[PDB]
Amino acid sequence: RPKLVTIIRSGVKPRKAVRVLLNKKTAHSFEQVLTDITEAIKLETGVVKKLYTLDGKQVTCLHDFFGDDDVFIACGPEKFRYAQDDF
Amino acid sequence: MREIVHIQAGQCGNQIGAKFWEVISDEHGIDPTGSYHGDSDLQLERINVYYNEAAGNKYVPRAILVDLEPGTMDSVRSGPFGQIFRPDNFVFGQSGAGNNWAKGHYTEGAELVDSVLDVVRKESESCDCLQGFQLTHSLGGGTGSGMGTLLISKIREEYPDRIMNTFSVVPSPKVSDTVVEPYNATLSVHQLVENTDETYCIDNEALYDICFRTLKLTTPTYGDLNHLVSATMSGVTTCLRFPGQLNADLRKLAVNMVPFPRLHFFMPGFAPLTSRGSQQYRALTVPELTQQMFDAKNMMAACDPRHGRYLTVAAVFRGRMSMKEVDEQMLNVQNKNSSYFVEWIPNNVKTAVCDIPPRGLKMSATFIGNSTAIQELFKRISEQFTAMFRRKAFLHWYTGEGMDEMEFTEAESNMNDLVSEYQQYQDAT
Amino acid sequence: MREIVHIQAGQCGNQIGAKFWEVISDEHGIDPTGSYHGDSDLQLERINVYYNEAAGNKYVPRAILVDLEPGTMDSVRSGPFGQIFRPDNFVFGQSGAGNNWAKGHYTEGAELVDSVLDVVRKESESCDCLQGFQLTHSLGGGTGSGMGTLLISKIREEYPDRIMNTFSVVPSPKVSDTVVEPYNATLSVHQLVENTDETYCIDNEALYDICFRTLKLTTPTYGDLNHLVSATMSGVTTCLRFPGQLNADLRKLAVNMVPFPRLHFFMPGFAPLTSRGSQQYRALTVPELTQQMFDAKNMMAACDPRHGRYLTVAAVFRGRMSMKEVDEQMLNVQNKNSSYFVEWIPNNVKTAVCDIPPRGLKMSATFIGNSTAIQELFKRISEQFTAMFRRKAFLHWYTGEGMDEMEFTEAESNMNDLVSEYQQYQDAT
Ligand SMILES: Nc1nc2c(ncn2[C@@H]2O[C@H](COP(=O)(O)OP(=O)(O)O)[C@@H](O)[C@H]2O)c(=O)[nH]1
Numbered sequence: 001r002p003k004l005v006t007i008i009r010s011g012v013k014p015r016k017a018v019r020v021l022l023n024k025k026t027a028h029s030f031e032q033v034l035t036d037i038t039e040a041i042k043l044e045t046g047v048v049k050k051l052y053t054l055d056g057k058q059v060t061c062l063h064d065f066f067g068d069d070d071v072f073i074a075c076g077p078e079k080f081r082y083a084q085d086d087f
Numbered sequence: 088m089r090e091i092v093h094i095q096a097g098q099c100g101n102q103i104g105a106k107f108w109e110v111i112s113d114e115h116g117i118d119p120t121g122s123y124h125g126d127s128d129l130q131l132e133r134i135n136v137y138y139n140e141a142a143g144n145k146y147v148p149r150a151i152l153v154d155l156e157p158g159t160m161d162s163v164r165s166g167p168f169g170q171i172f173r174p175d176n177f178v179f180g181q182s183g184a185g186n187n188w189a190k191g192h193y194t195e196g197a198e199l200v201d202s203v204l205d206v207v208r209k210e211s212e213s214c215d216c217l218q219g220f221q222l223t224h225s226l227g228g229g230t231g232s233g234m235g236t237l238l239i240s241k242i243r244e245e246y247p248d249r250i251m252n253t254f255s256v257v258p259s260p261k262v263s264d265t266v267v268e269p270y271n272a273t274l275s276v277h278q279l280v281e282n283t284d285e286t287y288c289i290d291n292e293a294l295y296d297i298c299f300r301t302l303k304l305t306t307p308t309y310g311d312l313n314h315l316v317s318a319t320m321s322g323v324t325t326c327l328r329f330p331g332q333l334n335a336d337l338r339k340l341a342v343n344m345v346p347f348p349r350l351h352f353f354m355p356g357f358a359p360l361t362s363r364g365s366q367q368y369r370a371l372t373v374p375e376l377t378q379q380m381f382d383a384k385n386m387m388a389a390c391d392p393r394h395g396r397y398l399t400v401a402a403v404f405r406g407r408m409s410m411k412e413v414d415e416q417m418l419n420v421q422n423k424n425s426s427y428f429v430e431w432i433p434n435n436v437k438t439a440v441c442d443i444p445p446r447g448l449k450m451s452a453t454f455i456g457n458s459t460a461i462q463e464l465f466k467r468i469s470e471q472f473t474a475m476f477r478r479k480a481f482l483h484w485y486t487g488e489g490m491d492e493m494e495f496t497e498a499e500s501n502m503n504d505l506v507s508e509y510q511q512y513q514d515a516t
Numbered sequence: 517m518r519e520i521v522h523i524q525a526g527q528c529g530n531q532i533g534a535k536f537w538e539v540i541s542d543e544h545g546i547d548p549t550g551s552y553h554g555d556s557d558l559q560l561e562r563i564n565v566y567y568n569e570a571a572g573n574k575y576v577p578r579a580i581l582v583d584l585e586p587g588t589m590d591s592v593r594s595g596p597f598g599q600i601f602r603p604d605n606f607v608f609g610q611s612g613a614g615n616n617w618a619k620g621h622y623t624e625g626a627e628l629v630d631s632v633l634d635v636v637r638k639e640s641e642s643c644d645c646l647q648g649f650q651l652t653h654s655l656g657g658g659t660g661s662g663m664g665t666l667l668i669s670k671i672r673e674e675y676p677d678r679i680m681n682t683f684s685v686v687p688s689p690k691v692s693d694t695v696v697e698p699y700n701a702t703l704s705v706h707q708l709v710e711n712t713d714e715t716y717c718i719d720n721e722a723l724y725d726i727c728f729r730t731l732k733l734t735t736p737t738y739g740d741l742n743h744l745v746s747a748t749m750s751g752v753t754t755c756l757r758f759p760g761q762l763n764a765d766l767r768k769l770a771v772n773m774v775p776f777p778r779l780h781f782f783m784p785g786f787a788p789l790t791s792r793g794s795q796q797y798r799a800l801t802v803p804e805l806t807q808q809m810f811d812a813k814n815m816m817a818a819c820d821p822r823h824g825r826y827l828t829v830a831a832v833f834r835g836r837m838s839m840k841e842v843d844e845q846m847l848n849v850q851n852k853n854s855s856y857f858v859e860w861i862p863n864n865v866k867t868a869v870c871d872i873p874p875r876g877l878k879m880s881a882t883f884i885g886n887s888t889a890i891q892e893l894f895k896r897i898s899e900q901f902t903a904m905f906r907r908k909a910f911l912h913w914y915t916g917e918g919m920d921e922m923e924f925t926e927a928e929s930n931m932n933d934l935v936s937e938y939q940q941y942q943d944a945t
């Protein structure tokens with residue numbers, strides 16, 4: 001029923017990839033997850049507008065884009081950084 | 088040397104220390120301010136085990152308190168001996184547990200644990216020579232069931248050589264304080280046997296009848312039930328902290344108490360217990376203390392030692408008494424109660440004699456039992472577990488917080504693999 | 517001997533000295549009138565470093581204050597310790613900066629500088645033996661960014677042998693006080709590395725969390741934030757001004773701190789920090805001060821020392837403590853934090869022990885850090901720089917005051933040539 005995915009922040013690399021819950025009972029909109037994530041992460045501006053994939057290839061827009069067991073990256077007003085986080 | 092860092096967790100885990108630290112500080116003459124008022128110089132001989140000596144000749148308890156809401160932490164400082172704690176150690180969240188093991192281990196537990204493990208480490212650098220950690224929590228609630236076990240799996244990776252013991256609160260047999268307490272039991276008992284060297288199981292239900300059939304208290308409140316929890320914990324470390332003829336510590340009470348490393352569920356007892364209307368009619372002799380311990384109504388757990396055999400028995404004594412006089416009593420109870428002990432273990436009784444009695448009495452003791460009578464304590468949990476789980480009942484909150492069925496299936500049979508060991512060692516020859 | 521002329525510039529550069537000179541005069545018992553009220557004769561042993569002894573047994577601070585408007589200078593004399601300054605040293609314009617680096621360096625800066633450089637020279641003739649100059653300004657505003665750097669390029673031509681250090685205010689990472697602060701940063705950082713021997717970078721943003729997470733101040737105003745700036749500056753010169761066992765000065769803290777002459781951006785730290793509700797629970801030991809300095813939340817700059825290695829570490833101590841006891845702690849933090857220091861530098865820790873503690877405490881210290889973690893501090897500026905400059909945004913005020921594009925292009929790559937040195941020395945072997 002829920003999703004086991006995780007998020008880091010870009011270009012700085014202290015982050016140990018916290019794994020917040022993603023479920024229908026705890027979330028009802030994709031934009032709601034983009035704002036509930038902001039208290040548990042730090043950015044430059046803090047606008048969590050976008051999130052790129054594990055390799056930063058494509059953008060995300062839906063809950064149904066979330067295959068299990070992958071890491072995403074904090075984005076928005078910035079670009080992808082080619083981070084070797086999971087190494 | 089030999090410092091012990093005290094860690095608390097849960098609503099039950101906090102208010103025990105408000106009774107526990109009142110007892111320990113009164114064994115050394117400490118006001119709730121934090122200065123010294125004792126008279127004998129023996130009290131400051133091993134004061135550094137529960138006290139980091141700060142400036143101004145003050146003393147602080149080496150204690151860390153954990154909750155997921157501040158509804159209990161402010162109630163500690165607004166009572167007696169609430170000023171003694173350092174205000175930096177109260178690490179707490181804001182939401183609350185929800186009485187959920189999944190939220191106590193994955194949702195809010197991942198956030199608060201980094202603000203605790205640095206504080207343990209900040210005390211660990213202050214440890215001149217670390218002995219081990221002790222934990223006080225429950226097994227039925229949300230915080231003390233999960234957040235305590237989330238510390239232990241991270242502490243044991245940081246300290247494999249250091250010992251670890253939990254004064255947990257096993258839930259009662261018949262009355263039910265918590266609706267989801269069979270789920271909180273089995274999912275935490277699976278984590279206890281991984282990374283704990285010993286565990287002292289305390290039931291709520293047995294402590295009522297001790298305070299009713301024996302103490303004859305009309306109105307037993309928590310100011311007296313938790314007092315017997317403090318007499319147990321102080322009754323173990325009383326050889327580490329004072330000069331006795333035959334010393335003991337948590338190191339000696341681990342290998343000499345646990346012969347097989349997964350069989351480490353104990354049962355405590357305390358003696359003597361004089362009522363206020365019955366104290367002036369009792370002989371204060373050393374063999375009087377022995378016959379009061381080994382019955383059913385002095386055990387601090389819902390157990391029947393008549394059905395089961397002991398394996399290791401630790402009796403920690405305080406006061407001034409003859410060494411030969413105690414050991415004659417410890418040998419005699421092995422002879423007459425020969426069915427009550429296991430056959431293939433000689434010298435199954437451990438003697439610990441200290442020389443400082445509890446304040447207010449003249450002589451006392453503390454019983455530590457290890458019998459196979461706790462198989463009734465867990466099979467009754469596993470019987471309640473398989474009834475609730477086969478209907479998938481109360482599952483849409485644990486599964487809603489990131490949990491699968493295979494987490495239950497391994498944890499279910501591991502308790503069955505636990506109890507099947509106890510029945511195997513019960514009736515061998 | 518060894519006098520130091522104190523120069524201020526900017527609205528930020530003035531009100532720091534109103535807190536700074538209050539602290540220095542209270543280390544020698546000086547009223548805001550300007551007479552003497554001390555009790556010990558040690559305080560007048562090196563009084564001539566910040567005080568020209570005038571007639572009538574009075575003392576004046578050897579200080580020069582610079583602004584482009586009198587809206588701040590009259591606010592200094594109408595407060596405490598505003599009567600102590602000589603009324604001839606307040607050299608100021610009438611128009612104002614406009615928060616423009618070009619107007620702070622070419623338009624109004626060319627007029628006011630001749631009325632300052634004679635006053636420095638009039639103090640320079642009064643210098644019995646000049647040590648060096650210290651400057652207090654900012655890097656984001658108009659006056660302290662430009663008018664300070666216009667003095668330094670003219671001072672260094674007059675004094676090549678004399679040392680020079682600026683307690684500048686590096687702008688915050690996330691919140692923005694000034695709209696044009698990336699232009700004011702890069703166009704001034706290009707001028708700092710030309711003619712400054714060392715620089716102590718202070719962020720606004722880190723000083724909030726020091727005054728909130730550690731001091732637990734409910735309402736931190738500038739009477740407490742600038743107080744930590746004064747504790748840094750007094751924590752450096754405390755070996756030059758009092759008899760200690762192992763002396764230090766700005767000469768020893770320059771060559772032993774800067775091994776490559778363009779790598780001179782530091783980070784300061786202060787210890788201890790006792791809250792008013794937490795001072796009575798802390799041990800006042802010497803190894804307590806070490807473990808409080810080397811974390812992230814005691815740094816006075818937005819830096820992550822976990823990402824980066826130190827090169828030179830200066831810890832200036834005050835009070836009475838053993839020499840072997842400190843050096844055991846300084847050696848131990850080199851052993852356990854071996855990834856946190858650079859490999860090819862042995863004895864990377866500088867010890868400075870004085871014998872006069874700060875007034876109000878018993879023992880204290882002052883941390884000076886030099887790590888490669890400031891590459892995040894400048895690349896974040898250069899990332900903000902290339903975004904604003906590629907649109908030619910906010911350029912029609914700098915170009916309107918006599919400035920070309922090639923002024924930006926050399927100054928842009930010189931910061932990139934600065935950071936590429938730090939990454940080069942970060943991970944070599
Ligand atoms: N002996 C004793 N048990 C208590 C006390 N307060 C709570 N408990 C027990 O704690 C258990 C409930 O756990 P609780 O503290 O509410 O949950 P948690 O805070 O989320 O870990 C039950 O078994 C209660 O009997 C107390 O003061 N004394």
Ligand SMILES: Nc1nc2c(ncn2[C@@H]2O[C@H](COP(=O)(O)OP(=O)(O)O)[C@@H](O)[C@H]2O)c(=O)[nH]1
Pocket residue numbers: 525526527528529531532613615654656657658659660661685686687693694720738741742
């Ligand atoms: N710590 C501190 N920073 C200040 C104070 N006043 C101004 N600042 C900083 O000074 C910078 C703005 O510079 P400003 O003085 O207005 O410009 P200038 O006078 O033209 O150099 C910002 O980074 C402010 O945070 C103060 O009292 N304390």
